[PDB]
Design a binder for this molecule. Sequence first.
Ligand SMILES: CCOc1ccnc(CCNC(=S)Nc2ccc(C#N)cn2)c1F
Lengths: 525, 402
Amino acid sequence: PIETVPVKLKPGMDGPKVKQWPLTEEKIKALVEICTEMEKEGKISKIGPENPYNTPVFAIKKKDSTKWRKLVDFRELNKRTQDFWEVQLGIPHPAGLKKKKSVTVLDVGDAYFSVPLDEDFRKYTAFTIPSINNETPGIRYQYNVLPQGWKGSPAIFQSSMTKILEPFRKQNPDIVIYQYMDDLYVGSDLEIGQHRTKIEELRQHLLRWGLTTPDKKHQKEPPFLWMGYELHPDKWTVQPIVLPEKDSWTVNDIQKLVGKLNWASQIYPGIKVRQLCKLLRGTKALTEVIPLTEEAELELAENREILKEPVHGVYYDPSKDLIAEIQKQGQGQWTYQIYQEPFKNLKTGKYARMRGAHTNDVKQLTEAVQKITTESIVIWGKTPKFKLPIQKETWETWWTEYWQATWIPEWEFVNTPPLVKLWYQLEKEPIVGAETFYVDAGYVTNRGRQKVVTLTDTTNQKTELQAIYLALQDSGLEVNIVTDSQYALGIIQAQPDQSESELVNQIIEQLIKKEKVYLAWVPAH
Amino acid sequence: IETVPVKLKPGMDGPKVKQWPLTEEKIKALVEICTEMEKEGKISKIGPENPYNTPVFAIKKKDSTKWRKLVDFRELNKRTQDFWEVQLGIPHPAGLKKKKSVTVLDVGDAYFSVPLDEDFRKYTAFTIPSINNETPGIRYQYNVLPQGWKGSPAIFQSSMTKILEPFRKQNPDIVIYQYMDDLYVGSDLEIGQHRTKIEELRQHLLRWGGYELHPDKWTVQPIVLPEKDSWTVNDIQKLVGKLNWASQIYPGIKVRQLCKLLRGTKALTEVIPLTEEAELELAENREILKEPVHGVYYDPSKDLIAEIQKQGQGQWTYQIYQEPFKNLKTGKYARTNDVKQLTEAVQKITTESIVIWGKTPKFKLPIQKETWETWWTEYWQATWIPEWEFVNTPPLVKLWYQ
Ligand SMILES: CCOc1ccnc(CCNC(=S)Nc2ccc(C#N)cn2)c1F
């Protein structure tokens, strides 16, 4: 049988002592029968009036079925049971799989029941079945195996399974098994019949420890509709996305759509949601109907196109390098796709995350690179060779300049417009000949120029950039600007090309225009 | 054979740290190593009853094709009780930091001998991760004294001095300091004569079962002012700004005569001759900067902070202080890529801290967590791990250091 995992209650706390809710005499009977079957098979065992502990038990009918089912409430117990390592949350992404000749998944029967429970804990699983007659038994039992609905059942169960599987796996390196709750997904490049054979070795091997599996004639095989994607032994896509042809769009509708849209991006390249995504501005209620904008309609229609033809992602070929390519799908938007074979997509994807109020393509593209690397390390345990629309000369320039340190893996330039570039650079030295503006809301130049202004609804910082702006404004092709705002300085010294603040974006505009610009900082008073 | 009952600080519980994604290569490496450590009963697979976790990493050794398992017990150590290391608890030899040359040895393996208190074992839990989550992940916990845990060098201390008192007695001309898994050996002998005495210890250590630092040649890179032919308004300006910032440290810095050259909205490039009056001010400030601010003493009860700046072209700068502006040391580092470099500086700076004060400082790194977390293990070689934090450097600061 399986070796028991020692369980304990959280420190200080004691076992659960809960009163059994009242029960229907009809149920009282139904249970006694269910709890006899269990006692007979050994899954549970009648205990003595010694054990104070006790959790309530309920009776329900199998959804759309006519009979009785036992349901024990362990909430209190679970609040008293130590924390376990606990199952994984992260599931395998399709693109990480290697193609298998054949695959079949098995549903494990009464797995939790086919697993023992640490005796020193068995008591804590105590419950009672009220006796019909006013003065009669009202028998108490306690679990012997893993209780469905109990905190540590999954972990232990899975854990146990891994132990059971160990051997088989060992002598069948060709086979690849994936544990997922009460399902075993098995894949192999074995020839059809040979496959179906090991599947029989397994099933038995499982039966060895009471683990029952479903019978071939009623098992489950591809296509495998798994967590959002449709999995074939050769390729993979997302489960077909149908865009509603609604006439009246509401706020949930959109939010819902936008969400489903995002989903696709991981494989359907070119999907765009911006136009939809500014249909949500100022919205007042989850039920507000928003009439679609022209570009939104343009977008929706355009997305329907991409969704119309099913596309596919292929599997990971551990024999070939991974290749990564990025393009600028627009301001803030970057698209990328990973393939091993020339455009043989394993996965695709977008990147619109703006890290900070201000940024430039170089910085952002790098961040995109970083995002991908991370992702890749997780899916294929290795970093891809990048193909970027930026020249080393361009990169390495901004590189050195920046205060933060950064590093992009082995990467190759790809002359595929648009190309990321720096629209401007601050002069490293003050300019000889250029006018010199001393900005503080106004400025004063070495050439007599002045322009003190006042305004409405401003921020202290906002006023500072304002000045600089005016300076760029009224200046010629080459300017030397001097300021005391260390804030404005940091921003511009970053040489951003994009920002949320329109103001900034204007200044940026000025800068791209100038021939030469020297920005200098000076002390307070 | 008996195990000294170790305990976490009061109320404290075990670490449940996340395990950063590791590359295939690394995992394999860890899989081989651990499989071995298992055979030798050093570690053991654990059940789900154990909810604790410590990050593990694989790093390559300097001048060796072999891989080394690096466990990040940073948190565990953090919540591990203290040990009476006051009374005969080493502590720290002021002599070492000047003993000419010093070599660092990894004695981690020495720990594998001593068994670890069973009740404490569960906290050493760690996991070898798997790609794309195909499988559960190999789980283990240490049975022996684990390399990297602060409890190890302590418990072993006893037996450790035991094994060293002889060599000490033999070569009292040699300073021998232990830190976690490292052994700092200092001496003034000549190189050839040094590397030899080291090997004598290399083998004297085997009797029971590769760096090259030069402590004496370290110096406090101070703040410096430009010294140029002619001085344009800009120069003055920058000059004054820097001066203004430094004044908060060295109060004797006057800028009066310098700011008077700035009266007026002149053109940035206009050359300003220095009026003798001012010329002396510079001269003075210039002389006040020739040395670290007086009265900056180290406090053992306070955290030792470290800030690095990317100076550019492969040049970095740092400062070690506990209290703002009150720098204990200040230095620079010159070379690759930003990260490799950064990790090098880091390791170097830590080493010094250890050697000098006997503690790893807390670094404030000018990088992005994701990046650091991605490549740091690629070039890291130390056996300890300082605590770090990531920050954005303000443009002016980097300026004031060069
Ligand atoms: C529904 C997919 O289930 C699985 C998920 C994760 N892991 C496995 C084990 C074997 N996986 C590998 S490498 N091969 C593949 C390949 C194709 C398909 C399909 N259709 C399933 N698994 C699975 F079978």
